[PDB]
Amino acid sequence: GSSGSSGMELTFNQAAKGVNKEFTVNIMDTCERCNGKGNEPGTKVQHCHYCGGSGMETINTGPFVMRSTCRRCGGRGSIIISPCVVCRGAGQAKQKKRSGPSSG
Ligand SMILES: [Zn+2]
Ligand SMILES: [Zn+2]
């Protein structure tokens, strides 16, 4: 076997532009213990007043006011007596995956 012609018909050297190669080694997926909730699967939760279920807090200082994400709940709308032990209330963790089917 031997050859060496040209044509430049199609391009099948690299993959699409969107799907960047080696995006990021580290793997981040939705927690499993809390299922992307941020609390222990064996604990209860309390209603937050600061935001009132909106996850938004307001800082009234003088003739002006500021706006920052609730601190008591953390922009959730409720107080987690016991925050997850895997994601520590992050909503995502490291899920060792090989393929990782986006759609599904
Ligand atoms: Zn709150
Ligand atoms: Zn978790």
UniProtKB/Swiss-Prot annotation:
It comes from the Eukaryota. Coiled coil: none annotated. The modification Omega-N-methylarginine is found at R33, R88. It is found in: Mitochondrion matrix; Cytoplasm, Cytosol; Postsynaptic cell membrane. Widely expressed with highest levels in heart, liver, lung and skeletal muscles. Also expressed in keratinocytes; expression level and distribution is altered in basal cell carcinomas. Zn(2+) 1 binds at C31, C34, C84, C87. Tyrosine phosphorylated. Zn(2+) 2 binds at C48, C51, C70, C73. Modulation of apoptosis, i.e. proapoptotic activity of isoform 1 and antiapoptotic activity of isoform 2, is J domain-dependent. Interacts with JAK2, HSPA9B and IFN-gammaR2 chain. Interacts with Ras GTPase-activating protein 1 (RASA1). Isoform 2 interacts with MUSK (via the cytoplasmic domain). This is DnaJ homolog subfamily A member 3, mitochondrial. The gene is DNAJA3. The chain holds residues 213 to 303 of 480 of the full protein.
